[PDB]
Scaffold this active site. Structure first.
Site, PDB file in Angstrom:
ATOM      1  N   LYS A  18       0.761  -1.273   0.000  1.00 20.03           N
ATOM      2  CA  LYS A  18       0.000   0.000   0.000  1.00 20.03           C
ATOM      3  C   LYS A  18       0.792   1.325   0.000  1.00 20.03           C
ATOM      4  O   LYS A  18       0.440   2.252   0.726  1.00 20.03           O
ATOM      5  CB  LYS A  18      -1.120   0.021   1.069  1.00 20.03           C
ATOM      6  CG  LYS A  18      -2.103  -1.135   0.968  1.00 20.03           C
ATOM      7  CD  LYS A  18      -3.093  -1.161   2.130  1.00 20.03           C
ATOM      8  CE  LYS A  18      -4.095  -0.010   2.066  1.00 20.03           C
ATOM      9  NZ  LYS A  18      -5.282  -0.276   2.945  1.00 20.03           N
ATOM     10  N   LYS A  37      -0.240   6.265   9.222  1.00 20.80           N
ATOM     11  CA  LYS A  37       0.133   5.707   7.935  1.00 20.80           C
ATOM     12  C   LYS A  37       1.018   6.720   7.211  1.00 20.80           C
ATOM     13  O   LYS A  37       0.702   7.911   7.159  1.00 20.80           O
ATOM     14  CB  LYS A  37      -1.102   5.364   7.104  1.00 20.80           C
ATOM     15  CG  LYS A  37      -0.776   4.639   5.817  1.00 20.80           C
ATOM     16  CD  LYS A  37      -2.022   4.239   5.043  1.00 20.80           C
ATOM     17  CE  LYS A  37      -2.718   3.012   5.650  1.00 20.80           C
ATOM     18  NZ  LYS A  37      -3.296   2.073   4.620  1.00 20.80           N
ATOM     19  N   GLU A  82      -7.494   5.981  13.410  1.00 27.43           N
ATOM     20  CA  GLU A  82      -7.860   5.252  14.618  1.00 27.43           C
ATOM     21  C   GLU A  82      -6.988   4.003  14.752  1.00 27.43           C
ATOM     22  O   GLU A  82      -6.602   3.384  13.759  1.00 27.43           O
ATOM     23  CB  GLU A  82      -9.344   4.866  14.578  1.00 27.43           C
ATOM     24  CG  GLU A  82      -9.830   4.037  15.769  1.00 27.43           C
ATOM     25  CD  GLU A  82     -11.236   3.458  15.566  1.00 27.43           C
ATOM     26  OE1 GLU A  82     -11.907   3.837  14.581  1.00 27.43           O
ATOM     27  OE2 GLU A  82     -11.666   2.625  16.401  1.00 27.43           O
ATOM     28  N   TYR A  83      -6.661   3.646  15.983  1.00 24.81           N
ATOM     29  CA  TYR A  83      -5.906   2.430  16.230  1.00 24.81           C
ATOM     30  C   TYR A  83      -6.819   1.283  16.606  1.00 24.81           C
ATOM     31  O   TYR A  83      -7.691   1.431  17.456  1.00 24.81           O
ATOM     32  CB  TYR A  83      -4.884   2.615  17.353  1.00 24.81           C
ATOM     33  CG  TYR A  83      -4.163   1.331  17.690  1.00 24.81           C
ATOM     34  CD1 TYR A  83      -3.432   0.664  16.722  1.00 24.81           C
ATOM     35  CD2 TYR A  83      -4.211   0.785  18.969  1.00 24.81           C
ATOM     36  CE1 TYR A  83      -2.765  -0.508  17.009  1.00 24.81           C
ATOM     37  CE2 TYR A  83      -3.533  -0.382  19.275  1.00 24.81           C
ATOM     38  CZ  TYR A  83      -2.815  -1.031  18.280  1.00 24.81           C
ATOM     39  OH  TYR A  83      -2.136  -2.202  18.541  1.00 24.81           O
ATOM     40  N   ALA A  84      -6.598   0.141  15.967  1.00 23.38           N
ATOM     41  CA  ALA A  84      -7.329  -1.083  16.276  1.00 23.38           C
ATOM     42  C   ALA A  84      -6.418  -2.032  17.063  1.00 23.38           C
ATOM     43  O   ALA A  84      -5.491  -2.629  16.505  1.00 23.38           O
ATOM     44  CB  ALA A  84      -7.848  -1.745  14.992  1.00 23.38           C
ATOM     45  N   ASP A 127     -14.239  -4.168  -3.459  1.00 25.07           N
ATOM     46  CA  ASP A 127     -14.047  -5.503  -2.901  1.00 25.07           C
ATOM     47  C   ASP A 127     -13.408  -5.428  -1.515  1.00 25.07           C
ATOM     48  O   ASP A 127     -12.825  -4.410  -1.154  1.00 25.07           O
ATOM     49  CB  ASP A 127     -13.185  -6.338  -3.838  1.00 25.07           C
ATOM     50  CG  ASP A 127     -11.817  -5.727  -4.052  1.00 25.07           C
ATOM     51  OD1 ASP A 127     -11.689  -4.863  -4.949  1.00 25.07           O
ATOM     52  OD2 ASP A 127     -10.875  -6.101  -3.317  1.00 25.07           O
ATOM     53  N   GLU A 131      -7.785  -9.232   5.565  1.00 22.80           N
ATOM     54  CA  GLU A 131      -6.602  -8.555   6.091  1.00 22.80           C
ATOM     55  C   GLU A 131      -6.870  -7.067   6.318  1.00 22.80           C
ATOM     56  O   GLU A 131      -6.258  -6.458   7.187  1.00 22.80           O
ATOM     57  CB  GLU A 131      -5.350  -8.781   5.211  1.00 22.80           C
ATOM     58  CG  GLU A 131      -5.583  -9.119   3.722  1.00 22.80           C
ATOM     59  CD  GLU A 131      -6.154 -10.540   3.491  1.00 22.80           C
ATOM     60  OE1 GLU A 131      -7.227 -10.862   4.057  1.00 22.80           O
ATOM     61  OE2 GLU A 131      -5.543 -11.328   2.731  1.00 22.80           O
ATOM     62  N   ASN A 132      -7.806  -6.497   5.563  1.00 22.32           N
ATOM     63  CA  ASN A 132      -8.221  -5.108   5.763  1.00 22.32           C
ATOM     64  C   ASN A 132      -9.373  -4.943   6.745  1.00 22.32           C
ATOM     65  O   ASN A 132      -9.962  -3.869   6.851  1.00 22.32           O
ATOM     66  CB  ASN A 132      -8.583  -4.440   4.437  1.00 22.32           C
ATOM     67  CG  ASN A 132      -7.437  -4.453   3.462  1.00 22.32           C
ATOM     68  OD1 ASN A 132      -6.278  -4.498   3.867  1.00 22.32           O
ATOM     69  ND2 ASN A 132      -7.747  -4.436   2.169  1.00 22.32           N
ATOM     70  N   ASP A 145     -10.143   0.645   4.705  1.00 18.54           N
ATOM     71  CA  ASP A 145      -9.925   0.586   3.273  1.00 18.54           C
ATOM     72  C   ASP A 145      -9.779   1.923   2.595  1.00 18.54           C
ATOM     73  O   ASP A 145     -10.291   2.938   3.055  1.00 18.54           O
ATOM     74  CB  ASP A 145     -11.047  -0.210   2.579  1.00 18.54           C
ATOM     75  CG  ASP A 145     -10.624  -1.607   2.258  1.00 18.54           C
ATOM     76  OD1 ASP A 145      -9.483  -1.965   2.631  1.00 18.54           O
ATOM     77  OD2 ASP A 145     -11.397  -2.352   1.642  1.00 18.54           O
TER      78      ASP A 145
END
Ligand code: VEK
Length: 247
Positions: A18, A37, A82-84, A127, A131-132, A145
């Site tokens: 990415k 990011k 945001e952090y997951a 789509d 993983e996303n 996404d």
């Protein structure tokens, strides 16, 4: 309101692009945890990203990864997200081998809620790969996404052969993957995978229940026009029986 790299302490990397990298991060003052990011202007698509960030910065939903803001220097562009804490759905599937019907249907509900919330804004999604899909502190699923608008295994026939029937096919591959442990059209070769999707040739193992087969079968239609509305997914009786979350 502006932002700079020196506003943040950086922790461990969470992944590679990415077009860049994601790192766990902390705002120095407030100590507030987030994900940063970093994308590079060369691989910059550049105009496109600008529009993506345009749309993503207006999306507020518990099951969409929040974009707090962005900034940039000469060489790079930074996304403050945001952090997951709990990682990817793809990783969870690996650990659990596969999900039960309750975990599965709750995820589908969450995905469909997000997609409908976006539908209510003429924003549609392409789509969707596991993983996303990330998980917040309470186990709630979150879409992460650049797949908003206006591997082969995850693509509908019309991508390989407000027109948003693509993400309904996505719901069906994921729901199958979730119950089964692998996507419906998985094959030994690329040529074989291609024909399986094109021909919509999938089968269920015996443990997969009827309400599940029903929903999955209605989602995996070659004809995009015949796939259900998001509203119909959330009202599916198998969804209604099994999911702990409401519309
Ligand atoms: C550019 C670019 C894209 C990627 C892939 N990447 C992976 C990491 N990303 C995360 C984001 Br954004 C927000 N929160 C996250 N939490 C995790 C996580 C926690 N424990 C394990 N993981 C993987 N990852 C997060 C999403 C997109 N890399 O560079």
């Amino acid at each position: 309101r502006q932002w700079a790299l020196e506003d943040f302490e950086i922790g461990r990397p969470l992944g590679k692009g990415k077009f860049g990298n994601v790192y766990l991060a902390r705002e120095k003052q407030s100590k507030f945890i987030l994900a940063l990011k970093v994308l590079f202007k060369a691989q910059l698509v550049e105009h496109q990203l600008r529009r993506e960030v345009e749309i993503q910065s207006h999306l507020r939903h518990p099951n969409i990864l929040r974009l707090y803001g962005y900034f940039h220097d000469a060489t790079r562009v930074y996304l403050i997200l945001e952090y997951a804490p709990l990682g990817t759905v793809y990783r969870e599937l690996q650990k659990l081998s596969k999900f039960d019907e309750q975990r599965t249907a709750t995820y589908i509900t969450e995905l469909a809620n997000a997609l409908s919330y976006c539908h209510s804004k003429r924003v549609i999604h392409r789509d969707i790969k596991p993983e996303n899909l990330l998980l917040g502190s309470a186990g709630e699923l979150k879409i992460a996404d650049f797949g908003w608008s206006v591997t082969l295994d995850y693509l509908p026939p019309e991508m390989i052969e407000h027109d948003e029937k693509v993400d309904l096919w996505s719901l069906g591959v994921l729901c199958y993957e979730f119950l089964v442990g692998k996507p419906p059209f998985e094959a030994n070769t690329y040529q074989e995978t291609y024909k399986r999707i094109s021909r919509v040739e999938f089968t269920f193992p015996d443990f997969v229940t009827e309400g599940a087969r029903d929903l999955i079968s209605r989602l995996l239609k070659h004809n995009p026009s015949q796939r259900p509305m998001l509203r119909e997914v959330l009202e599916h009786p198998w969804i209604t029986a099994n999911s702990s979350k409401p519309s």
